[PDB]
Amino acid sequence: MGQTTFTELMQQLFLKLGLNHQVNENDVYTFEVDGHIQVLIACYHQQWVQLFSELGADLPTNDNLFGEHWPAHVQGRLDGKSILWSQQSLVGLDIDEMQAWLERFIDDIEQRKE
Amino acid sequence: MGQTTFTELMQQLFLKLGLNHQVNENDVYTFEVDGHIQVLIACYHQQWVQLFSELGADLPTNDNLFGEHWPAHVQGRLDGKSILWSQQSLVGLDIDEMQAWLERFIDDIEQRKE
């Protein structure tokens, strides 16, 4: 509430996923899939859950249009590194949708790599 | 379900702002700000409110990083025209955040066109 709601949501998530993870002092949750995809999960302003992943080799530019995923997955740049991110509001976010969104996000990264 | 909430939100929004709008047959809300800026608002899947505006030129690239606004404003590329868009769930969007968000988006547009 809102960090506590986030922390209890993260706890349910990692249990349901049976995934090793890390949490730093900033409440940023880190995990790795398939020994290469590192995914970061953070809560901003006690309200917005933010997914983030660094896209690794150099990837072609995305038109960054909405419509393909809900919420959208956005390909950005950062220190000259392509990254992918997606966000949604914590309000009325539950574990089933949190799990589905994470799955969607992982599948897109997996595909963008290619 | 979701669309009535959306329709009620939009109706309230237009009154509060004292703006002329149109709605087409797809429930997409159009308006002009100060008679130069055109913002489009639609609801997808009875869940996602989507803000959209053509930036009206071919504007310089944007690293497209989250973090400057909540929810983020993304500058995308559609048919060689830059556009700006922003989304968030309809669950816990009330008239008050709906109004502030719209104002942040408008302000950003006003700045981005230069």
Side-chain angles (χ1 to χ4, degrees):
Chain A
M1 37 151 164
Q3 207 59 24
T4 330
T5 314
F6 173 65
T7 302
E8 64 216 318
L9 182 64
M10 289 302 90
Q11 302 178 147
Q12 281 192 298
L13 181 61
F14 292 107
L15 271 162
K16 192 154 179 234
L17 293 184
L19 277 178
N20 288 348
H21 62 280
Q22 302 76 238
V23 185
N24 71 12
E25 73 284 348
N26 293 325
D27 292 317
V28 177
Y29 283 70
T30 290
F31 67 103
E32 203 170 53
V33 299
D34 302 345
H36 87 282
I37 298 155
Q38 180 178 110
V39 181
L40 262 73
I41 310 178
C43 188
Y44 291 79
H45 305 304
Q46 298 202 81
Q47 303 168 38
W48 293 97
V49 181
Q50 184 72 47
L51 301 193
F52 157 107
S53 191
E54 193 192 330
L55 290 173
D58 266 16
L59 283 84
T61 210
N62 203 280
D63 287 352
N64 282 323
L65 287 188
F66 55 92
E68 176 178 345
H69 318 79
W70 292 101
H73 299 175
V74 175
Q75 187 172 312
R77 261 223 190 268
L78 184 56
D79 317 296
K81 290 156 162 206
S82 260
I83 62 141
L84 188 69
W85 58 259
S86 172
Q87 76 192 181
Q88 70 186 307
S89 60
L90 194 62
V91 174
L93 177 71
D94 64 29
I95 195 76
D96 283 344
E97 165 69 25
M98 186 62 246
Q99 181 175 353
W101 173 37
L102 189 65
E103 278 158 14
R104 269 198 299 283
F105 189 70
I106 292 164
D107 296 334
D108 185 4
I109 297 160
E110 304 192 327
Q111 186 185 17
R112 279 180 213 232
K113 288 221 212 207
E114 323 140 274
Chain B
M1 219 258 187
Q3 216 73 359
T4 335
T5 309
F6 179 64
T7 296
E8 292 165 319
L9 187 60
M10 291 303 94
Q11 299 178 147
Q12 286 187 249
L13 186 62
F14 294 108
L15 273 160
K16 228 157 168 280
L17 294 172
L19 287 169
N20 294 343
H21 57 302
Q22 38 278 321
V23 201
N24 71 10
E25 350 72 55
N26 274 103
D27 292 336
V28 176
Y29 288 75
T30 288
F31 58 101
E32 212 155 48
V33 180
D34 286 316
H36 60 115
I37 296 162
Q38 182 162 113
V39 179
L40 271 53
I41 317 171
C43 185
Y44 292 71
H45 308 301
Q46 297 181 31
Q47 297 161 78
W48 293 95
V49 181
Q50 184 68 56
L51 264 48
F52 165 100
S53 186
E54 268 173 53
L55 289 172
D58 316 338
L59 280 59
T61 299
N62 184 274
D63 302 359
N64 263 328
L65 281 199
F66 52 103
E68 177 171 356
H69 319 76
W70 297 93
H73 299 170
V74 180
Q75 171 191 315
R77 186 56 151 188
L78 181 75
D79 305 314
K81 287 164 164 185
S82 314
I83 58 132
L84 189 78
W85 55 264
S86 177
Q87 43 185 217
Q88 56 172 312
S89 20
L90 184 76
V91 176
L93 198 46
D94 50 48
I95 198 201
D96 294 312
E97 170 62 9
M98 178 72 237
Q99 183 175 348
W101 173 33
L102 192 52
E103 294 172 342
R104 292 190 289 275
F105 194 72
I106 289 157
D107 289 1
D108 187 7
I109 299 172
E110 262 152 16
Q111 182 212 349
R112 271 190 229 221
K113 307 181 299 86
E114 280 195 14

